[PDB]
Design an enzyme around this catalytic site. Structure first.
Site, mmCIF file in Angstrom:
data_model
loop_
_atom_site.group_PDB
_atom_site.id
_atom_site.type_symbol
_atom_site.label_atom_id
_atom_site.label_comp_id
_atom_site.label_asym_id
_atom_site.label_seq_id
_atom_site.Cartn_x
_atom_site.Cartn_y
_atom_site.Cartn_z
ATOM 1 C CG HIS A 166 -15.662 -4.789 2.218
ATOM 2 N ND1 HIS A 166 -14.527 -4.018 2.351
ATOM 3 C CD2 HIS A 166 -15.409 -5.946 2.878
ATOM 4 C CE1 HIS A 166 -13.624 -4.682 3.052
ATOM 5 N NE2 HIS A 166 -14.136 -5.853 3.383
ATOM 6 C CD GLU B 291 -12.604 -0.432 -1.024
ATOM 7 O OE1 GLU B 291 -12.714 -0.588 0.214
ATOM 8 O OE2 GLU B 291 -11.630 -0.862 -1.681
ATOM 9 N NE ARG C 44 -4.183 -1.673 2.176
ATOM 10 C CZ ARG C 44 -5.206 -1.680 3.024
ATOM 11 N NH1 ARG C 44 -5.250 -0.807 4.018
ATOM 12 N NH2 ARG C 44 -6.176 -2.574 2.889
ATOM 13 N NE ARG D 18 -14.397 -4.709 14.729
ATOM 14 C CZ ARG D 18 -13.704 -3.626 15.076
ATOM 15 N NH1 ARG D 18 -12.559 -3.346 14.464
ATOM 16 N NH2 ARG D 18 -14.152 -2.827 16.039
ATOM 17 C CG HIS E 178 -8.723 2.698 3.185
ATOM 18 N ND1 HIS E 178 -9.646 2.152 2.319
ATOM 19 C CD2 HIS E 178 -8.245 1.670 3.925
ATOM 20 C CE1 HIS E 178 -9.724 0.849 2.527
ATOM 21 N NE2 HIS E 178 -8.882 0.530 3.498
#
Lengths: 408, 408, 408, 408, 408
Positions: free
Chosen positions: D248, D251, D55, D238, D379
């Site tokens: 999600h 997204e 990332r 989680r 993000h």
């Protein structure tokens, strides 16, 4: 109401500009640029003039920098013609007029030479490989026979051999010198060109003209004393017209704003008299020459009291008036100058523009009717292109620098 | 990959510029600008130097044109200083260093007086009423004691009373003459200052440098003969350090591209060697000075074989390299130059930039570690503002002309 | 020299604006907006004033249109506060001040109610679903109790129950009425608001102020006769200060230029007295209030001879002066105005701006030294946002219209 | 009301972007990027994760293209890390987690390998000389072990030796595959990447989520049959949480719009269902997850009847919502999306943004109070940079192509 | 001097473009597009050619994206024709020529089919509902009969029934394959077409041409071995002219730079030989074909030593030369390329442009005089529209993407 610095107005100007560039190309002859008539055809009997050839060289340099195909070709044609027949390869400088059969006028006229200087300086902005060399020589001819270091002013003319210089000093030759000096300056930055311009101006305008309610005195004796009565016996004669020629006054006004702008461009506070006098000349042209006899239009000549003499409406005076209106507007931001500009454009398309035969008429009646010849297009750029550029650098330099419509 | 001429990068540059303009404001002292330490505090013992005061005047003139409140005030303060304590109201010029109690170093050094010239020329771009007068005076001092008409080069130093000049001639003093001369030209548009620039350069660079693998010879004798062996005895003395100092080489490179641009601006095809020698100096700097000892960074000094002498990483050298990278990019469009610029920026934020204590560190280890002082911010504009401007006109003139980010 | 309409300067203004928006957000309290102190802390003792709450609603309506997150939340909070405790749900209108424990000041103050109107109008530019209903209600209160239809002017204040209005008439209440009316006009186009504004101006400025060397007379009796003597024996007192308060003079100048522009915006030639009087007020403010006692800065009050009284340098006066310099520059293109603008910005960063504790200091002694309340950021928008927008439509409307930096 | 595509808003976004870039900078560790804590400190016990390293590689490739010094260096650091300890040089691919002592988690996780693909594809946009080689190797690994040619979908994971793929299939891995595939497509133009993206979306969103009232089913068996009860025994947990994860859903919404845009960019009419389902998912996310329990914010997990389960407000869900809001606005020009965007920004600055310690909080309790942690910044680009770019090409490609603020 | 990327020049180009679009509309015939004469009249005897019809479809797709009324109608007409009389509904593909009575030439010509592929791809950029279908079918025809997967090159032609392909291979058919493939790539973003293009050029140019002093060999045997003597018996027959045709050389140059730009756009460093060979082909064209016989202009054919054969000055060669000049200038920023462009524009308006009868003349003497057909305008977009667009994406795509004048 709002025309200056608007793309819509500028597009209109550009389009008329192209119609004018197109009209001028028909003047191409072997020795340079011929004399165009009322339908765009050449008047052979007029031959090939120096002033007309140098102007066109200047005109198409502007067109070349505007990205027009063929303009550069005309520039090449102008440079070669200035290195050809017109050039006195025996005594130097250029003949006043020549044809394919030889020389028609061998006299060396100042104004026509300063126009050679302008053409060269503008030709330089195109980057033509022969341009800079033409300017160098021209600068030589000028400093050798037209710029007097003793008087710190410009001479009027000489015989072919440059043996004897005329015992006359004029405002027109010195005005076109200021005009050319500005561009030579823009392409050299040799300080002398600008100082000389300011010098010519402080004399003819800030000194003489200003003390006479801003009416420019055109004729001076060899000692630079006004010859007021000059030509008083041939009043209507245009050449060296008696009294003041208002069109010149306003043209002088603009040139001084270009001087003003040049000084500002180098972070130098310009002398206040340039702007003051420019306005002075501007207002005086409207005061004595705009519609003073029952109809719109600028009269050609006026006497020393402000009274009209030659009342015919010649084309270039109003054309220069518009250029000057723009210059003043640029420095003052005063709406009155834009109003005059718009008003003058309405007059032009009403009486001067000829969409049927091309270009604009040369001159009209005191009642604005056509009556005598359109060998010039050079002045037109002062109301068609100048309003799309800053005041510094000069016309050609600015276009070449990509400044067209910069403020819009 | 793509940073030059991008608004995103330029915004980054502007923000760091402000951080630095802010850092420098603390140098303000009664007699001019003090010597700032590692935490932005003034080092009183150092006193007020002529070169720091002149640089700061230059710096805030740029900030003033960028519209930063306070800047203009600092400009005024700089002009007051250049007219006060620092000035020798007896023999002329300015003392090298002074303080609240009196003069500290009455010597008159060339490079310091040339920075005085740059400072005044830059101040002129702000329009400050007292600026032009300051420049004219500086012009006097320079033409009388530092520019040699006979040598057609600049002198090095004189004692206080200008009784005798130093039997030495250096590339640094003359380099900062070229730097200052370019700006004087931008605010006077006089051909000479630029003719003098080219002259200085044709000698120190096109002649000597170009024949020495582009390693600039710094020390000369009164007859301008290279004294390669100068200081070969003395240790790593920074003052007139033995050998060649690369940072200066890359700086000369940019200066000549500015000269190139100036000539192009007045429609004059510039000499091909300005650009040739620019590339040459750039390459030579990377060749002998960039990461030659197992670590990134530019070494300070190198010998005539190109071997490092002083291996410390001083700040200004890489800062100038970045500036030159931009100039070469602008005239060649070659991507390698942009790669170096970004490469050098990464190095700078990683080892030089001090967000903790302010500004940037002045000098690092051979291993890029901070070791043994942040008196300058003038150089930084060369990598923070120059990349946002065209090469002509100069730094201050361009900003004042509203050319910031013009090409972005 | 050139800051107005330049992106570099405007970027500086925006960044400072964000610093101010952040500071004021710490004023949020359950009942509306608190009184912020020297460190940006709430001075809960002060409670929740109506004027401060209305001003913040206006401020964050601007911040919201500028795309700053959180801003809209404060706008929503501002509106709820205007519909809550601050609102007199028995007699209408709003209490002058309240807190979590109840009403602290039940008086109905005119100027505060006009600020309520400005707040509602600006809030409408954000589109908040409850803003229009808030403005409509505010209109009723205003037309019912503060816009005297009989007097064609604004009343001063009423007791909690609106049973008796004060036997006094002031310029401040009427000036903020003009300020608010301009925005209501922008969000309604109900001719009456602009007409009322002109009317107010013509009387307080064109009639009274202009005949007294442009020194605004603030106090009048219920028959609108000026009470020149008012508060005499209590000079140092600032509430309804004795004599003239220059800060207000220059502010009236700007407001009148906004009226000017409002009229031009609907293609109507505005009366010349607007611009004429604006210049008068501006000059009048420099004459008596700027550095009259051997130190830069604007004095707070002055007598009828133009001689100072309260010599402290309060913040808002010079902030408004800058806003007015911009307005006048915009309508005359006269550089003297920009010069004052820059001079004042340099003064503000040198003595007023507090980067250490936040926002700006609110007051300095006659020697420009910080004395010891930093409530209000509303004035600051007049020197931070106003310069980035045309004069029409008004502040909040212009930003919501996306005209930020339109002229740069 | 108007923020999208306004320079004022976008300047705010960029400034916050820099504050975020600066924050992640401290994650640099010898093996890649570490796990940052609440104060921006490296939490060593967490070690070096593949997903975090990938990332960050992606993140600084964007920063590099935005002209941020230091960013390119981080890109280089990231690429070297992807060729170092994290890379299984024996079996291929990359270990899930490692540290300076050795391999902590040798499993080969699909979602992390797709982030590796995204990171490489983005690094390629910077021009880094090692980027392409990294992308090609990554592609090979992907096609070899994660993109099932037989299933025409993505696999979940394998053991270190790639000898046993997990008997499970998930939407998260397939979703990040789509995210990566879009960028690989942008830097290769090999149709297969976009076709695989469409296929994945057609199955998980159009053929399953759509028939489930747009609640994305995350858990499937090897035959791609939903496992609704997956982990019903431990909802609060989680990893692979029970039911649906709204963040999600929204997204997936944006990802399908980038897909839509990609097809438009090659003059191909995109299938109607991409936009229809994006609106679908956006709607469902508001329906079930936005402020459904008495306080603002998005809950983490949702029941099959739309009932919250994990009510803590995690950071990324709302960050992604803002991105999708922008995407839907861009394709529908419906103001409702802009209103949500602004409302969510207000929420963010009020509860999530941490100016005191840095970056943003990662999680808040059901009442929006900071709980218990700041290991990600990837993000955030979705709400900070996505809004300043067109939907095609993707994030890194578009910034590299100079499209930042293109529509502003 | 400066024309590229200047709005003033581009406006000139747009206006001539309209003059050209207007001329071509007269070609409309029931079966597609006719053969136009020197006065813009249809030469019915020539019937409807496939290559002409496909070129016009392409031409008006561009006009339509430029917002010209009527254009889209011609696009529609083009598609109808490609689905009508021209299409061989029995064997597939299109007949080389037909009329209202039937089929005139049933042969299946490769270069004409590639133009069909280009016309369809260009038509796709307008969004016409039937374009993609036409493109899809053309792709099938091309991949089945004209692109050889075994030869990895293009075939020349076939008979009507597609029973036997010609025992010949040509550089022209393969050149227009690269031209069409570029645009197919832009509307499919399928690397397959760019790979095939890069392959074609690596053989025809980097292989053969570069080794023959960049003189492109166009005649090959079925084994791809040059047939140097081909048509030596007909040395003045323009069809498959003997030796080398420079017009084609310079055209390959531009095409390879589009290929270069295409690779750059997807962040892929392009092979250095594309730009290297383009430069080479440019120089070769000037070396052998520009003014090699005492008069300006490009000769049509040249022998293997660079000596002229067909000396008539055909229109398309110089038109293509200007296009390539632009492309090289765009990638090298080298002034010589712009100088040639300008030089060539001056030549075109001087001898080729026909304002009197419309469009441009098709061919001239070796003396540049008109003699004894203006069936094309497709080539003209290469000197009129291409200079206003970036090199990627291609012509039609870039206009449809709104890139016209993006760099000016």
């Amino acid at each position: 109401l709002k025309w200056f610095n608007t793309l819509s107005h500028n597009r209109w100007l550009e389009q008329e500009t192209d119609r004018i560039f197109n009209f001028g190309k028909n003047a191409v002859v072997p020795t340079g640029f011929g004399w165009l008539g009322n339908k765009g055809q050449i008047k052979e009997e007029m031959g090939t003039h120096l002033w007309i050839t140098a102007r066109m060289l200047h005109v198409y340099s502007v067109a070349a920098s505007m990205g027009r195909p063929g303009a550069y070709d005309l520039v090449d044609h102008g440079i070669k013609a200035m290195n050809g027949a017109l050039r006195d390869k025996k005594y130097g400088g250029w003949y006043a007029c020549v044809n394919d059969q030889g020389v028609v006028d061998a006299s060396k006229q100042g104004y026509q030479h300063f126009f050679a200087l302008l053409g060269a300086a503008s030709a330089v902005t195109t980057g033509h490989p022969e341009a800079r060399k033409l300017l160098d020589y021209t600068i030589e001819v000028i400093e050798k026979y037209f710029w007097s270091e003793e008087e710190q002013m410009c001479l009027e003319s000489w015989d072919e051999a440059f043996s004897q210089t005329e015992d006359y000093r004029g405002g027109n030759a010195n005005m076109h010198a200021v005009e050319a000096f500005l561009i030579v300056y823009d392409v050299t930055h040799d300080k002398k060109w600008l100082d000389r311009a300011l010098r010519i101006a402080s004399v003819i305008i800030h000194d003489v003209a200003r003390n006479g309610d801003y009416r420019v005195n055109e004729h001076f004796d060899s000692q630079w004393n006004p010859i007021r009565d000059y030509n008083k016996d041939n009043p209507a004669h245009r050449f060296r017209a008696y009294g003041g020629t208002p069109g010149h006054w306003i043209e002088w006004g603009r040139l001084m704003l270009h001087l003003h702008a040049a000084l500002e461009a180098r972070f130098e506070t310009p002398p206040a008299w340039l702007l003051e006098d420019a306005k002075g000349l501007f207002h005086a042209t409207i005061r004595d020459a705009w519609a003073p006899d029952g109809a719109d239009g600028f009269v050609y000549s006026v006497d020393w009291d402000g009274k009209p003499i030659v009342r015919e409406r010649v084309r270039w005076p109003i054309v220069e008036a518009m250029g000057t209106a723009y210059a003043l507007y640029t420095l003052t931001d005063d709406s009155q100058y834009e109003e005059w500009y718009q008003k003058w454009w309405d007059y032009c398309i009403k009486y001067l523009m000829d969409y049927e035969n091309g270009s604009w008429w040369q001159e009209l009646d005191a009642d604005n009717k056509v009556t005598t010849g359109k060998q010039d297009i050079y002045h037109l750029l002062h109301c068609l292109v100048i309003p799309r550029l800053p005041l510094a650098p000069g016309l050609a330099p600015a276009v070449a620098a990509g400044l067209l419509d910069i403020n819009a």
